[PDB]
Structure formats: structure tokens, C-alpha cells
Design a protein around this ligand. Structure first.
Ligand SMILES: [Hg+2]
Length: 180
């Protein structure tokens, strides 16, 4: 759909997410991910990575149990299926770090609060960055900030049971270091 087309073109055919021929990529989705957007994105990733690469598609609630090989992914994309509104727990970030290879990169999108609210599980941008660091990632950087569309606002209501006036999307990246 249009959301996925926008994602594809604006990221240089996903080159800006490190997607290219031969890359091993995992795409993490959840029930907030529109099915057509997920299928559309997977189709594009399969075309880009080709026969020598790999696209593994994982629901966030199945990721831990899927028990992928340690250090087997070049790129992991999470929360990025257009329309998704997904929160990433410390446990999920740690598992992502485990299955990335050293030098592998996570690109993550998560709706965050502009200010701290201890009544909701939504984080701030700062706390989310620290979560990536504690999971073991390095070169942790914020790449983009976006407002939510009305549908994504509804999605946060429906799927995260949360209502706020400071909900922005942040896109963050982090890299797995070699073991020390
Ligand atoms: Hg990268």
C-alpha cells in the first residue's frame, strides 16, 4: 500500500535501512501491523535481498520462543511496518541484540511520550535509547521524529490502551558490537 511505498522510496529502496542483496534481515510485526502493509514490505525485502539473502518474519510475541541462531542477522527492522504502533520491552531488545551478528544493525520505530508519565508503559525517547544501550547495542542514535496519523493515534488507543497529547514516533538505530 501507499504507506509501504512511501517507506520504500523515502529510504532509498530501503538502502537507508541497510537492506541490499545478500543481507539477512528479520522484520518484527505485531497485531497493530496492517496485514497488507506487512505483506507489501516483506515482498519488497525479499526482492531486495534476493536468493543469497534471507527475510525472516517474526511476530514480536513469538520472537523469544522462535530462538533464532545467535549472531545470524545483518539487519533487524522492528515497529516499522507502516501503521504499526509497537512498544519494545527490555527482553525484546536483548533478544534482538542476541540474534544480530556483530556489526549488525537494528532500526526501530516506537511511539514515545514527550514527557515522563509513570501511569503508562510508553517511554520517552531517552529511556528508549537507554534501553537499547542496556541491551548491549552501541552507536545508538535517533534518526527521525514523526507525528502520528489519526489511524496511528487510534491504534495507540486500541492496542496500547493509552491516550496522550505528546505521542510522537521516534526512529532509532543501534549496532551490535563485537564481544569484549
Ligand atoms: Hg547500520
Amino acid at each position: 500500500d501507499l504507506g509501504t511505498e512511501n517507506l520504500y522510496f523515502q529510504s532509498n529502496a530501503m538502502a537507508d535501512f541497510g537492506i541490499s542483496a545478500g543481507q539477512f534481515v528479520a522484520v518484527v510485526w505485531d497485531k497493530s501491523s496492517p496485514v497488507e502493509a506487512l505483506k507489501g514490505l516483506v515482498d519488497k525485502l525479499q526482492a531486495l535481498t534476493g536468493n543469497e539473502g534471507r527475510v525472516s518474519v517474526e511476530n514480536i510475541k513469538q520472537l523469544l520462543q522462535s530462538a533464532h541462531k545467535e549472531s545470524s542477522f545483518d539487519i533487524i527492522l522492528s515497529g516499522l511496518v507502516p501503521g504499526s504502533t509497537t512498544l519494545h520491552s527490555a527482553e525484546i531488545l536483548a533478544e534482538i541484540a542476541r540474534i544480530l551478528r556483530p556489526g549488525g544493525c537494528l532500526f526501530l520505530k516506537e511511539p514515545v511520550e514527550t514527557a515522563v508519565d509513570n501511569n503508562s508503559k510508553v517511554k520517552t525517547a531517552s529511556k528508549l535509547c537507554s534501553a537499547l544501550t542496556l541491551s548491549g547495542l552501541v552507536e545508538v542514535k535517533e534518526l527521525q521524529r514523526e507525528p502520528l496519523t489519526p489511524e496511528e493515534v487510534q491504534s495507540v488507543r486500541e492496542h496500547l490502551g493509552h491516550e496522550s497529547d505528546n505521542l510522537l514516533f521516534v526512529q532509532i538505530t543501534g549496532k551490535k558490537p563485537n564481544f569484549e
